[PDB]
Design a protein around this ligand. Structure first.
Ligand SMILES: CNc1nc(Cl)nc2c1ncn2Cc1ccc(CO)cc1
Length: 164
């Protein structure tokens, strides 16, 4: 069912994560970690202290889809292992040393065609698929977007609710 999912999303904050390639999203799903640029790392750390749940919604550039969503379980921390991110052009490894731990809520895909009816007030009411890495998604839009994803029956939200 969706009841525990709705509970997790209650009063959550949502942020759009735009990855340049699938490999980093695959690594994030396997290891439960994410890293972003310093400007967004600061935003996520502020949000983590401010909200009962902080939700990252992932989209690989040019894929035309979202690849799932996850809840921050910690602030960023350095010096814990060297994550073998595939680094885009202009992207060095020192701009990813901040590692957040995340718990996946859904690892299923959602095509952009299914979210065309949702606009984000914090990005000029453009379709929620549109936005830069780190763009915040307003509560109602973010909640409805997460509820569009196919259910991920491999995930038990009981442990996530306890992290809260
Ligand atoms: C592990 N995390 C990430 N993995 C990937 Cl492949 N792209 C990301 C990630 N975070 C943000 N972006 C988009 C971006 C923004 C700025 C530059 C600077 O050249 C490169 C890429």
């Amino acid at each position: 069912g969706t009841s525990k999912l709705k509970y997790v999303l209650q009063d959550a904050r949502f942020f759009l994560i735009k990855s340049n390639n699938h490999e980093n999203v695959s690594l994030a799903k396997a290891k439960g970690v994410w890293s972003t640029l310093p400007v967004n790392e600061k935003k996520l750390n502020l949000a983590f202290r401010s909200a009962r749940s902080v939700i990252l919604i992932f989209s690989v550039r040019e894929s035309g889809k979202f690849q799932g969503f996850a809840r921050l379980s910690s602030e960023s921390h350095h010096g814990g292992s060297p994550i073998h991110w595939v680094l885009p052009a202009g992207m060095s490894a020192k701009m990813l040393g901040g590692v957040f731990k995340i718990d996946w809520i859904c690892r299923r895909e959602l095509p952009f065609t299914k979210s065309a009816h949702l606009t984000n007030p914090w990005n000029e009411h453009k379709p929620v698929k549109i936005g830069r890495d780190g763009q915040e998604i307003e509560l109602e839009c973010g909640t409805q977007l997460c509820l569009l994803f196919p259910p991920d029956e491999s995930i038990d939200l009981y442990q996530v609710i306890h992290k809260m």
